[PDB]
């Protein structure tokens, strides 16, 4: 539903090329529209990879949930400086806002990043461009599916070894929609683009 609250501002700067924010984004978004959310709204990183449409005095801006604001009460967003300025007066420090989690935000096809230190014995995966909350990430083991566990820093990790050769990953969103991503490589650090979408381009 709609949340009513307020915003402060902060910055990750240009950031780095490995992990940005508690959500470990591969990069600070090019448009610099991102946000840190309260611990309850962070929901153990379930909010990672999701977007908020935040309405303020001067308009509505779309921000990627990138980070956790431990000191933020529910309803209190810590907006990027760019998002803050798009909404109100920077020098005001705190502005009134309302926001919603975006349903099926426009974006590219799903991509997967294998975490540094991964191997067949134990691996982490980050799912990019799912658009909405992800509830399941699984790797194919023959006929079965091996369920990964959600970490609090934006990845999913394996509970036991996976087969050698290409990985087939199945991702299921909060709505029960699933994409199946075959031919993935055990290649730490690489952003592997796929041909899949949870929803078509509209």
């Amino acid at each position: 539903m709609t949340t009513h609250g307020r915003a402060t501002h902060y910055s990750l700067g240009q950031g780095n090329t490995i992990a940005n924010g508690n959500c470990s984004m591969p990069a600070v978004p090019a448009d610099r529209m991102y946000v840190a959310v309260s611990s309850p709204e962070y929901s153990g990183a379930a909010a990672c990879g999701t977007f908020l449409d935040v309405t303020g005095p001067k308009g509505t801006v779309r921000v990627q949930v990138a980070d956790q604001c431990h000191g933020c009460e529910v309803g209190h967003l810590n907006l990027s400086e760019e998002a803050f300025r798009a909404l109100g007066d920077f020098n005001a420090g705190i502005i009134p806002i309302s926001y919603v989690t975006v349903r099926d935000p426009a974006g590219p096809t799903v991509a997967i990043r294998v975490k540094e230190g991964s191997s067949r014995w134990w691996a982490g995966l980050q799912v990019l461009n799912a658009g909405n909350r992800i509830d399941r990430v699984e790797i194919q083991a023959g006929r079965q599916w091996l369920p990964l566990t959600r970490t609090d820093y934006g990845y999913w990790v394996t509970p036991s070894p996976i087969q050698d050769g290409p990985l087939t990953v199945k991702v299921t969103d909060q709505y029960g929609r699933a994409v199946v991503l075959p031919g993935l490589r055990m290649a730490p650090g690489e952003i592997q683009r796929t041909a899949s979408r949870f929803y078509p381009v509209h």
Side-chain angles (χ1 to χ4, degrees), residues 119-125 139 146-149 156-162:
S119 68
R120 313 332 203 97
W121 294 277
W122 184 86
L125 301 179
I139 292 174
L146 183 75
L148 285 66
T149 55
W156 293 76
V157 293
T158 57
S160 56
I162 65 136

Short mmCIF file of all heavy atoms in Angstrom, two decimals, residues 119-125 139 146-149 156-162:
data_model
loop_
_atom_site.label_atom_id
_atom_site.label_comp_id
_atom_site.label_asym_id
_atom_site.label_seq_id
_atom_site.Cartn_x
_atom_site.Cartn_y
_atom_site.Cartn_z
N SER A 119 32.18 -21.48 -5.81
CA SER A 119 32.63 -22.67 -6.52
C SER A 119 31.48 -23.68 -6.47
O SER A 119 30.42 -23.37 -5.94
CB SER A 119 33.88 -23.26 -5.88
OG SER A 119 33.59 -23.79 -4.60
N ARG A 120 31.70 -24.88 -6.99
CA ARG A 120 30.64 -25.88 -7.02
C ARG A 120 30.28 -26.33 -5.62
O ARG A 120 29.16 -26.76 -5.36
CB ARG A 120 31.05 -27.10 -7.84
CG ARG A 120 31.67 -26.79 -9.19
CD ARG A 120 31.19 -25.47 -9.76
NE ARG A 120 31.34 -25.41 -11.21
CZ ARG A 120 30.37 -25.67 -12.08
NH1 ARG A 120 29.15 -26.00 -11.67
NH2 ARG A 120 30.61 -25.59 -13.38
N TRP A 121 31.24 -26.24 -4.70
CA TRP A 121 31.03 -26.69 -3.33
C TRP A 121 30.17 -25.71 -2.54
O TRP A 121 29.41 -26.11 -1.65
CB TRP A 121 32.38 -26.92 -2.64
CG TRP A 121 33.15 -28.06 -3.24
CD1 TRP A 121 33.00 -29.38 -2.96
CD2 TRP A 121 34.17 -27.97 -4.24
NE1 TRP A 121 33.88 -30.13 -3.72
CE2 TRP A 121 34.61 -29.28 -4.51
CE3 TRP A 121 34.77 -26.91 -4.93
CZ2 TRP A 121 35.60 -29.56 -5.44
CZ3 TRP A 121 35.76 -27.19 -5.86
CH2 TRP A 121 36.17 -28.51 -6.10
N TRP A 122 30.26 -24.43 -2.89
CA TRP A 122 29.48 -23.39 -2.24
C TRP A 122 29.54 -22.12 -3.07
O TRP A 122 30.62 -21.68 -3.46
CB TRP A 122 30.00 -23.12 -0.83
CG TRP A 122 29.17 -22.13 -0.06
CD1 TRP A 122 28.06 -22.40 0.68
CD2 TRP A 122 29.40 -20.72 0.04
NE1 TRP A 122 27.58 -21.25 1.24
CE2 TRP A 122 28.38 -20.20 0.86
CE3 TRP A 122 30.35 -19.85 -0.48
CZ2 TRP A 122 28.29 -18.84 1.17
CZ3 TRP A 122 30.27 -18.50 -0.17
CH2 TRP A 122 29.24 -18.01 0.65
N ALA A 123 28.39 -21.54 -3.36
CA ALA A 123 28.33 -20.36 -4.21
C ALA A 123 27.28 -19.38 -3.74
O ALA A 123 26.32 -19.75 -3.06
CB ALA A 123 28.06 -20.77 -5.65
N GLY A 124 27.47 -18.12 -4.11
CA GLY A 124 26.47 -17.09 -3.90
C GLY A 124 26.04 -16.54 -5.24
O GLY A 124 26.86 -16.43 -6.15
N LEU A 125 24.76 -16.21 -5.37
CA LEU A 125 24.23 -15.59 -6.58
C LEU A 125 23.50 -14.31 -6.24
O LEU A 125 22.76 -14.25 -5.25
CB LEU A 125 23.25 -16.52 -7.29
CG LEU A 125 23.71 -17.90 -7.75
CD1 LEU A 125 22.54 -18.63 -8.39
CD2 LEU A 125 24.87 -17.80 -8.73
N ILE A 139 18.89 -23.85 -7.84
CA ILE A 139 19.78 -24.35 -8.87
C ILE A 139 19.42 -25.79 -9.21
O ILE A 139 19.17 -26.61 -8.32
CB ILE A 139 21.25 -24.28 -8.45
CG1 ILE A 139 21.70 -22.82 -8.35
CG2 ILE A 139 22.13 -25.03 -9.44
CD1 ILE A 139 23.10 -22.64 -7.80
N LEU A 146 17.69 -27.39 -6.11
CA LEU A 146 18.36 -27.09 -4.85
C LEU A 146 18.07 -25.66 -4.42
O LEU A 146 18.48 -24.72 -5.09
CB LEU A 146 19.87 -27.29 -5.00
CG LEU A 146 20.68 -27.08 -3.72
CD1 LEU A 146 20.52 -28.28 -2.79
CD2 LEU A 146 22.14 -26.83 -4.05
N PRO A 147 17.35 -25.49 -3.29
CA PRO A 147 16.97 -24.15 -2.82
C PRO A 147 18.13 -23.40 -2.16
O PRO A 147 18.77 -23.93 -1.25
CB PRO A 147 15.87 -24.45 -1.80
CG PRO A 147 16.22 -25.79 -1.26
CD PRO A 147 16.83 -26.55 -2.41
N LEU A 148 18.38 -22.18 -2.61
CA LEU A 148 19.38 -21.32 -1.98
C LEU A 148 18.73 -20.49 -0.88
O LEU A 148 17.51 -20.35 -0.85
CB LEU A 148 20.02 -20.38 -3.01
CG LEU A 148 21.05 -21.01 -3.96
CD1 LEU A 148 20.40 -22.04 -4.88
CD2 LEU A 148 21.75 -19.93 -4.76
N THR A 149 19.55 -19.94 0.00
CA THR A 149 19.05 -19.16 1.12
C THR A 149 19.40 -17.68 0.95
O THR A 149 20.50 -17.35 0.50
CB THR A 149 19.62 -19.67 2.45
OG1 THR A 149 21.05 -19.66 2.38
CG2 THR A 149 19.14 -21.08 2.73
N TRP A 156 22.14 -14.80 -2.70
CA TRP A 156 21.53 -16.06 -2.29
C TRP A 156 22.64 -17.10 -2.29
O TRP A 156 23.47 -17.10 -3.20
CB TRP A 156 20.43 -16.47 -3.27
CG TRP A 156 19.25 -15.55 -3.26
CD1 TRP A 156 19.18 -14.31 -3.83
CD2 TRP A 156 17.98 -15.80 -2.66
NE1 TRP A 156 17.94 -13.77 -3.61
CE2 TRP A 156 17.18 -14.66 -2.90
CE3 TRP A 156 17.43 -16.87 -1.94
CZ2 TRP A 156 15.87 -14.56 -2.44
CZ3 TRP A 156 16.13 -16.77 -1.49
CH2 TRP A 156 15.36 -15.62 -1.74
N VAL A 157 22.68 -17.96 -1.28
CA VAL A 157 23.78 -18.93 -1.17
C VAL A 157 23.30 -20.37 -1.10
O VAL A 157 22.21 -20.67 -0.61
CB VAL A 157 24.67 -18.64 0.06
CG1 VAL A 157 25.41 -17.33 -0.13
CG2 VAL A 157 23.83 -18.61 1.33
N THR A 158 24.15 -21.27 -1.59
CA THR A 158 23.82 -22.69 -1.67
C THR A 158 24.02 -23.39 -0.32
O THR A 158 24.96 -23.08 0.41
CB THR A 158 24.69 -23.39 -2.72
OG1 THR A 158 26.08 -23.20 -2.41
CG2 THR A 158 24.42 -22.83 -4.11
N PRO A 159 23.13 -24.35 0.00
CA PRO A 159 23.21 -25.09 1.26
C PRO A 159 24.00 -26.39 1.12
O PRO A 159 24.24 -27.08 2.12
CB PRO A 159 21.74 -25.40 1.55
CG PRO A 159 21.16 -25.63 0.19
CD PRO A 159 21.94 -24.74 -0.78
N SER A 160 24.41 -26.71 -0.10
CA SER A 160 25.13 -27.94 -0.39
C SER A 160 25.64 -27.88 -1.82
O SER A 160 25.19 -27.04 -2.60
CB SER A 160 24.22 -29.16 -0.19
OG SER A 160 23.05 -29.05 -0.97
N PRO A 161 26.58 -28.77 -2.18
CA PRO A 161 27.25 -28.65 -3.48
C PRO A 161 26.29 -28.76 -4.66
O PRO A 161 25.23 -29.36 -4.55
CB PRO A 161 28.24 -29.83 -3.48
CG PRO A 161 28.45 -30.15 -2.03
CD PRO A 161 27.13 -29.88 -1.38
N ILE A 162 26.68 -28.16 -5.78
CA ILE A 162 25.91 -28.25 -7.01
C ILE A 162 26.74 -28.95 -8.08
O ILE A 162 27.97 -29.02 -7.98
CB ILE A 162 25.48 -26.87 -7.52
CG1 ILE A 162 26.70 -26.04 -7.91
CG2 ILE A 162 24.67 -26.15 -6.45
CD1 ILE A 162 26.53 -25.31 -9.22
#
